[PDB]
Design a protein around this ligand. Structure first.
Ligand SMILES: *[C@@H]1O[C@H](CO)[C@@H](O[C@H]2O[C@H](CO)[C@@H](O)[C@H](O)[C@H]2NC(C)=O)[C@H](O)[C@H]1NC(C)=O
Ligand SMILES: *[C@H]1O[C@H](CO)[C@@H](O)[C@H](O)[C@H]1NC(C)=O
Lengths: 121, 121
């Protein structure tokens, strides 16, 4: 909403654009999860690394649940139990235009981060 | 971060500021997961809401697995199995300065979105 604005009575800026500072705060943090988490899960998933050279991050990994149900101790799928996806709403930056008139714009993308096992209702 | 540069063959501006266009692409979307997914999951989790007025989005919801083990049909924790979190790297905007000198800078935050049930290692 009003998070990107200025008070009307402010000195104008061409294009009706805002100031985006350089540098990503915490650009260094790394995600840490169990190894092969998407295989060892009772509700395994597969990963698709979607790519876009005009988007930051360029690589956005989407997950897809491997089965309709969950896996049990034996390694068998159990359809009495459901494998459901977990969605995270995120933000990525899109790079607009060519030449020196390059600009950026926020984009909202929903990411499926993996799957969990639920009991159907 | 080479991503936010302009072609060298361009006339330099200020000291270092990019152009952020107004509007959020696809702002109209809303994550849709199973009802009470966080409770019906064999590896359930609770939600902790953090709030910061100078950040977009303001509310970043962190998740925390309720148990060490997963839960069986009966309803008891089974530590032969593990409730582990799923972490996603996201981008949030941080608001800097006040009034007309308002400026924005990207910030990366790891969000723990929910939990899945895995086999121990
Ligand atoms: C999940 O990913 C696996 C890759 O490990 C997919 O693999 C299956 O289908 C492939 C088709 O090209 C075959 O090459 C694989 O041999 C086959 N193996 C397995 C274990 O699935 C699989 O289809 C994907 N599953 C889903 C639901 O998308
Ligand atoms: C989740 O765990 C918290 C403690 O961290 C507990 O107080 C809360 O009530 C739990 N959730 C439910 C639905 O009981």
């Amino acid at each position: 909403h009003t998070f990107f604005q200025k008070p009307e009575s402010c000195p104008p800026v061409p294009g009706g654009s805002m100031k985006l500072d350089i540098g990503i705060i915490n650009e260094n943090q790394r995600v840490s999860m169990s190894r092969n988490i998407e295989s060892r899960s009772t509700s395994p998933w597969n990963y698709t690394v979607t790519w876009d050279p005009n988007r930051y991050p360029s690589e956005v990994v989407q997950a897809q649940c491997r089965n309709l149900g969950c896996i049990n101790a034996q390694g068998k799928e159990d359809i009495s139990m459901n494998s459901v996806p977990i969605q995270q709403e995120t933000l990525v930056v899109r790079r607009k235009h060519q030449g020196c008139s390059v600009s950026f714009q926020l984009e909202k993308v929903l990411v499926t981060v993996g799957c969990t096992c639920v009991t159907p209702v």
